[PDB]
Design a protein around this ligand. Structure first.
Ligand SMILES: *[C@H]1O[C@H](CO)[C@@H](O[C@@H]2O[C@H](CO)[C@@H](O[C@@H]3O[C@H](CO)[C@@H](O)[C@H](O)[C@@H]3O)[C@H](O)[C@H]2NC(C)=O)[C@H](O)[C@H]1NC(C)=O
Ligand SMILES: Nc1ncnc2c1ncn2[C@@H]1O[C@H](COP(=O)(O)OP(=O)(O)OP(=O)(O)O)[C@@H](O)[C@H]1O
Ligand SMILES: [Ca+2]
Ligand SMILES: [Ca+2]
Ligand SMILES: [Ca+2]
Ligand SMILES: [Ca+2]
Lengths: 258, 372
């Protein structure tokens, strides 16, 4: 099971209209059995529409989706899209975290939470919590995911949860001293898979902004050691610096279960 | 009250449904006449798999569904998808149970006998309404303007019609239908606005050309020396701010769009236009009734709302009609709901009770009963 999280900058109608860009997004997406795509700025859903026409042009069911409604206190919004190969996993259930929206709401873009059922892995059921944090707010939000993990446990009585997305978790947005205030980091319930080492930006910066975090004893026993890493599509696909960034300024972070 | 409160009025259109309770002044529910069917398998967060979508959820989610219009040119073309729009209207939009509400429905001008019998079959046999009634649309528009004889120019989203009515009976052989309406009109503006050097590229650009048409479009009288005026370039121009900053300017085209209703030639249509058609309807009627029709040109429909439509029509038919005649173009302000309001009045009326087709009439006479 190859799982990944991919922030495609401004995935939209326009981005899907370039053929060259569209072909590379489709090719990346086809490396994964479960993919989360962030920064889905698609109002009518036309762009998600095009992306699935491409994935499903020859079997109608190569991929099935889960999509949020648009999200943002900010009010310039984006959605969460999961796309999974239905022959590999099923979606048992789903909900949008209730962050308090007022003034209190803990997140810019409330995690969509999706419970999967997998039969070829050691973990047979597990939830995936999705987050693209407001960079400005990164420290409070990676910490409030501790509370979304606790909700998945109340609601679904599930320990094996994966939390992933673009956490803006490094460089200026979270520093060495701030980590000490993120429960998601301090609680040894959670194993962080993409280290603080990792560069997950397509631009010149080096930051491990993009994370995959696993709690659950069985989920942690299913992660194939050392498969968790970013995907350098520029380096893999020989792209230029110009082309690579035209896809996104970020790289997928993937992991493999077994 | 039993049914004083209880009568429903549903006006089925080519673009919009208008619905609500007889008694109200305006429709409680207005929404697109679409039924979306998802192109792929999947779900929204927190919802289950949905087989179908109707109205605004079909419009909003249009990128993953195949949209379909049940009513082509005012006539119901797909009965599976129409029963879906009705279901949505009762249960979700008005949130009523239909089996205890009398339902007044509307049909189009020369609606095939068989359809009026079919929607009766579906109203009584799949929705189990107590009683129902089908009114002709132009006829409710006229009546909502107080009168009983006049000629209605009715124009909405997919059809335009002229329905001469005399003491309530719409005159079959004098009715004219022109298949060019507000839908056609938004797509023509689209091109004269891209042709002004623009791009309605994403779907958030497409949709708002229609909101430009509604807000800024005009029907000028003397459309001749209005183009001439455009050229001297007066402060006739009008800039609209898009979803974002992108201030688009529309000076002139603003009225080139409703000049399409008088000149179908602007759009490769060879048919005659609105005013000539008003007139031709009229020289197809009895002679003795033509002074009546001329002093009672009632307008209804979303596309007849373009300001100065009435003045242009006023002068358009004065100058075709014999000078001994009195011309009079009535265009009320609520006209985008005339049809509905005429139904609300009629169905809440004290004397209408004895025309309701009841399940007693139906179970005993077959669909023929309401067909008249
Ligand atoms: C979508 O993809 C590419 C990447 O964003 C778009 O442009 C790329 O980068 C340059 C600048 O647009 C393109 O070449 C240009 O050619 C003109 C013609 O002489 C020149 O004036 C510029 O200096 C520039 O060199 C190039 O085609 C393209 N890169 C690649 C690898 O294709 C491209 O325009 C997009 N296509 C569409 C349909 O939007
Ligand atoms: N202010 C306005 N100016 C011009 N066009 C308008 C305006 N308001 C609504 N319309 C147009 O009228 C159409 C909707 O009107 P209407 O409800 O009369 O049609 P309908 O009943 O759905 O269809 P049919 O053609 O079958 O009667 C759309 O094209 C809409 O843009
Ligand atoms: Ca929020
Ligand atoms: Ca980098
Ligand atoms: Ca680092
Ligand atoms: Ca109508």
């Amino acid at each position: 099971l190859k799982i990944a999280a991919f922030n495609i900058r401004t995935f939209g109608e326009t981005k899907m209209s370039n053929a060259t860009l569209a072909s590379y997004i489709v090719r990346i997406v086809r490396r994964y059995d479960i993919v989360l795509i962030q920064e889905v700025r698609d109002s009518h859903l036309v762009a998600v529409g095009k992306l699935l026409d491409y994935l499903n042009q020859d079997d109608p069911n190569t991929y099935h989706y889960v999509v949020s409604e648009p999200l943002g206190r900010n009010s310039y919004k984006e959605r969460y899209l999961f796309l999974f190969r239905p022959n590999k996993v099923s979606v048992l259930d789903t909900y949008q975290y209730d962050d308090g929206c007022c003034g209190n709401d803990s997140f810019s873009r409330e995690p969509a939470v999706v419970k999967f059922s997998s039969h070829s892995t050691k973990v047979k059921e597990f939830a995936i919590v999705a987050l693209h944090s407001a960079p400005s707010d990164a420290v409070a939000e990676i910490n409030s995911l501790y509370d979304v993990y606790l909700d998945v446990q109340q609601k679904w009585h599930l320990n094996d949860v994966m939390l992933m997305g673009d956490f803006n978790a490094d460089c200026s947005y979270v520093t060495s001293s701030q980590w000490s205030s993120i429960r998601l980091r301090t609680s040894s319930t959670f194993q962080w898979l993409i280290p603080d080492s990792a560069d997950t930006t397509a631009t010149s910066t080096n930051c491990a902004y993009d994370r995959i975090v696993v709690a659950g004893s069985l989920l942690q026993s299913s992660v194939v050691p050392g498969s968790a890493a970013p995907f350098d599509f520029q380096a893999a696909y020989g792209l230029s610096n110009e082309m690579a960034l035209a896809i996104s300024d970020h790289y997928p972070v993937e992991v493999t279960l077994t | 009250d039993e049914d004083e409160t209880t009568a429903l009025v549903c006006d089925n259109g080519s673009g919009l449904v208008k619905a609500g309770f007889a008694g109200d002044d305006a429709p409680r529910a207005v929404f697109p006449s679409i039924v979306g069917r998802p192109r792929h398998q999947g779900v929204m967060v927190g919802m289950g798999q949905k087989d179908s979508y109707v109205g605004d959820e079909a419009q909003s989610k249009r990128g993953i569904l195949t949209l379909k219009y049940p009513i082509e040119h005012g006539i119901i073309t797909n009965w599976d998808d129409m029963e879906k729009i009705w279901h949505h209207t009762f249960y979700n939009e008005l949130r009523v149970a239909p089996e205890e509400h009398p339902t007044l429905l509307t049909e189009a001008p020369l609606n095939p006998k068989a359809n009026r019998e079919k929607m009766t079959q579906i109203m009584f046999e799949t929705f189990n309404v107590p009683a129902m009634y089908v009114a002709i649309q132009a006829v409710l528009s006229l009546y909502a303007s107080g009168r009983t004889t006049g000629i209605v120019l009715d124009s909405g989203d997919g059809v335009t019609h002229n329905v001469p009515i005399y003491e309530g009976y719409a005159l079959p052989h004098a009715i004219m239908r022109l298949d060019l309406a507000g839908r056609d009109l938004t797509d023509y503006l689209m091109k004269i606005l891209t042709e002004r050097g623009y791009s309605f590229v994403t779907t958030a650009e497409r949709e708002i050309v229609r909101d430009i048409k509604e807000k800024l479009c005009y029907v000028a009288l003397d459309f001749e020396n209005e183009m001439a005026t455009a050229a001297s370039s007066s402060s006739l121009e009008k800039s609209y701010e898009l979803p974002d900053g992108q201030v688009i300017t529309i000076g002139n085209e603003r009225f080139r769009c409703p000049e399409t209703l008088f000149q179908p030639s602007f759009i490769g249509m060879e048919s005659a236009g609105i005013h000539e058609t008003t007139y031709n309807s009229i020289m197809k009627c009895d002679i003795d009734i033509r002074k009546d029709l001329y002093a009672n040109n009632v307008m209804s429909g979303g596309t007849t709302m373009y300001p100065g439509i009435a003045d242009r029509m006023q002068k358009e038919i004065t100058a075709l009609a014999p000078s001994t005649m009195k011309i009079k173009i009535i265009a009320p302000p609520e006209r985008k709901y005339s049809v509905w309001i005429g139904g609300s009045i009629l169905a809440s009326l004290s004397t209408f009770q004895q025309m309701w087709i009841t399940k007693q009439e139906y179970d005993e006479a077959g669909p023929s009963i309401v067909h008249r």
